[model samples]
Target: RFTTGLVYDTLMLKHQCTCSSHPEHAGRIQSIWSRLQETGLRGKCECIRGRKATLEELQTVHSEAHTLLYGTNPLSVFVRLPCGGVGVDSDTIWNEVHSAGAARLAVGCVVELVFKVATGELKNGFAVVRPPGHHAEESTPMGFCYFNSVAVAAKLLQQRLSVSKILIVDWDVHHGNGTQQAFYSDPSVLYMSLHRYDDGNFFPGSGAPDEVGTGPGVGFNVNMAFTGGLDPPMGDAEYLAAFRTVVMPIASEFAPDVVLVSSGFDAVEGHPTPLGGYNLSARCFGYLTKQLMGLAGGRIVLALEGGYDLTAICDASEACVSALLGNELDPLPEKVLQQRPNANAVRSMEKVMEIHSKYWRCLQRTTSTAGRSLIEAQTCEN
Candidate 1:
């Protein structure tokens, strides 16, 4: 009924910089690997951390400056670039082979999955590679990312698959500013991100609700900025609510041939190491995975983005694999401590729905969008 794929590499861990003590890029493989081991999912899994991403692949989304800053030189510490910092960006901190090799493999894995989906060999796949790239912008590497593997993969799909639309969904606790900015002006590529935000109010701060894509890409940008953070970290009620309220509606309508997820575990709460709020249990992650299968005919690719909490990344992402395999699990228990969202917060959401409602039916919200509009006015529905 379902097919699950995993990309892995032990070599990626060897790439390092002067900052970090180890080159555990392969550490990403460990997260989902251990869980697969626990679940005995070996029977249904395919793991191969393929070749690193190429510069041409990088060009799909990265501009020359952005590419040069991180993609070109992983060891250089020139003028400050992107969100990483001055002298050196986090993604740029890796040794030459670190990101390059890993990126190629990440890109290769996705390319294979894209082909599989196109040719009916496999429906979707997940890449457990390291040095997450969704946070890096077009020309600047920020977060702990470089050479957007998924972005490169997505663009390749656009080119080879000849598919007219592509949608990227990022649900990390931190915003996918890089992903959003990468496709911010492209209409065919729909970029949607739900993350904690104070409106560029924090470091690498981003995901402002009103910051939809520009021009032809206008309505394609779906940004959901949450206050207090993605609550119940990886659970149903809040996360699912947000997904149902925001993500699902549009995804169904856009109906891309492929769906890409920047699968970061920082949003999962209390996984030995916690990033923020409530515990987004593994089960909920499974539920989401299963749902994605239904949406894009299982043509989904999940690239590891960010997850300091190793355990959470493992458990939560394991849930995703289970979901893809159609292995049913109990729903994550909803937490009770969720604070009622404030008016301004509500307004921020309403503004996005209001502004983008014209092109998409999902953004339609009519119940008291009574607040200062952060984005422009447009037709909205109930």
Candidate 2:
């Protein structure tokens, strides 16, 4: 039912700057791989290794600036670039030696494996790659990403597979400005993000609800800009509400052939982010996975983006994997099921619906019954 692709060489993409180490490192991948192995998923699911993306394949999404900065120099040394400093920015770091090769491998694995799934070789797949790509822009590589892997793969589906429309759901703590920028003007791809936007104070400073898209892509871009300083920080209840009320409605109307997730675990419970503060649980992620399975005949591709906490990533990832394998998830704690979404979360959904209802017929809180039933009927038991 599900497959997993990992670029073995991605382990070589590590940080070695004067700073301690980049949160996006080999350990993140290792932890997820180990957890999958421990749970016997490696033996059950189709474990596929990815190939390297070609020059033409990359040109589909990334600009020449990124192509030259990371690809032009192939010397296996820890040399600094002329861009600014050790890394692309203060937070994003790179190694002159293994960065490019690893980035290509990561990109290739997600793109090719998803294409395989599209061809019915597999139902769905997940990629555990570092130097996460959702934050990388078309012309500039930032936030520990070299190439926008998900964006590249989505375009590849349209280019090579001749797919009609693609849906990208980015649940990362940070906004996927890169993916949004890639498809902001194109109506073919719908980019939706549930993130913490402190009113343009966040890192990339983008994803406001009004910043939907330009021209034909106006309603295609959906941003669930949750209130930051999350006093009663957004958790399963809030996120699930947004998914049922906003995400599923728009996605159903779009009727995408495939679904791509910029799956970032930084928002998972107990992962202390530099900016985001939420208590999203691992089982919640499992539930989210189950909900998405209702679309595209379960044709979904998950590409890892950001998560600093190793334990959180492992637990959250395992939860998602178990759901993808058609296994029932462990029940939510009694206390959790009783908890309600924050007041702000409910208000945010109301506002988003008010804005998006103008475009999608599936919207409107009063008429959303089947979507709620689908969410309620999913496997929420061990």
Candidate 3:
């Protein structure tokens, strides 16, 4: 989580990108004010620093499209910092650098950001790059992802970051099934997500209420399924209740050296897709980011995830960036404020916490300072 000044890489696509409204590249932000505005953030986005991932890095997380391929059969593709695969995902497509190269590019930025701190640069940092990952699985891709970016980062962070007891909080609208699968058996990286679970209608239909982490990952996986009803649907973490109840307490207990966030702007109201809970607003995400920053000495990386609406993505994304930088948010119009969701999401958030409490140890420990004094003072940033 090294912060050599907050950095962002512009998207490049020869034949348009997923961020465009048409084309298979419908969701990717292929260079624009989305991430380019922060041009001054990066000293160098194209340079390959020693922090890049290698085939050795990729093997630790992926198992090939099928188990028969095994680990490292492809030699050192993922381990290589700039290695790019062609057509790694079903719905995904990219050129040499536009496709798989983009994933590697994002991962490379994380490696450098963390490396800067490990080698002593600044503090924790964030990479404002995307084509949005997390839907891709161990061997193959189910969504737009070619390679599981955070999963690779988790492995690299585990070995390279050199800190155990990891915790991942995914606040995207979609489930981080790829991330869940990658770290499903290791308590080292606790994968937790708060997303919209509306039956099997979403792209990837696996995150059920009972689909907790299996094996070593059983108690590590947490899901806040916001099952909202049709009318005035107000029953979930929408009321600033979920973050306070579940995410905050668990993250406090785990006390990870570095917390990886699968941040998606789609959770904001009036997003490009209107599938998830209605109560969640962009402002809530801002507060939630602030709360998470309070933990692990503010060692957190807000990775981009899902957000379809261009305007919503821009606004909500700015909110997240502002939270991380501890800056004031850009003013919004009163007309937009009317679209914010109500407080009905409170009760559902409570129930969801109750259901997950049996598996983890946070229900009664909301105020418990289990590791209060353990909070280090001015330690290395993740």
Among these predicted structures, which one has the highest TM-score?
2
What TM-score, to 2 decimals, does candidate 1 have? 0.81
Off by over 4 Å in 3: 1-4, 11-53, 64-90, 94-97, 117-120, 233-239, 272-279, 328-347, 365-382
Note the residue pairs that clash in candidate 2.
none
Per-residue lDDT of model 1, residues 220-281, tens digit only: 88887765433323333445555655677788998987788888776676633223454556
- Could you tell which candidate, 1 or 2, scores higher by lDDT? 2
Model 3 poorest 10 in a row by lDDT = 369-378
What's the lDDT of the predicted structure labeled candidate 3? 0.58
Clashes of 2: 0
- How many backbone clashes does every candidate have? 13, 0, 23
* Candidate 2 stretches greater than 4 Å from native: 1-19, 74-85, 273-275, 364-382
In terms of lDDT, model 1 sits at 0.65
lDDT of 2 by residue, 1-382 (tens): 4454333444444534433345666788887888988988767788676777776788888877668667654542233544443665666767666567778778888887788888788878778776688888878777788788899999999988899889999999889999999999889899999988767777678888886788988889999887646678878877877887789878888988899999998887776556456789877898888888888888887888888788988888888888887887888776666556666776676767777777777674364332232235254311
Report how far off residue 28 is in candidate 2 (Å). 0.7
Q: What tens-digit string does per-residue lDDT give for candidate 3 at 1-382?
A: 3332343455423323322323224334543233435633233222223222455556666764432232212221222112233443334544543444455555556656555543355555555555556876777655566556677777876776577766788877778888888877787778888767655466577676666677767777777765554357432234344565667777788788777788876666664344454545665567677778898777777666676656556555556666766766544334333333333344445655666677667675553221111112113112
- Which of the two, 1 or 3, has more TM-score? 1
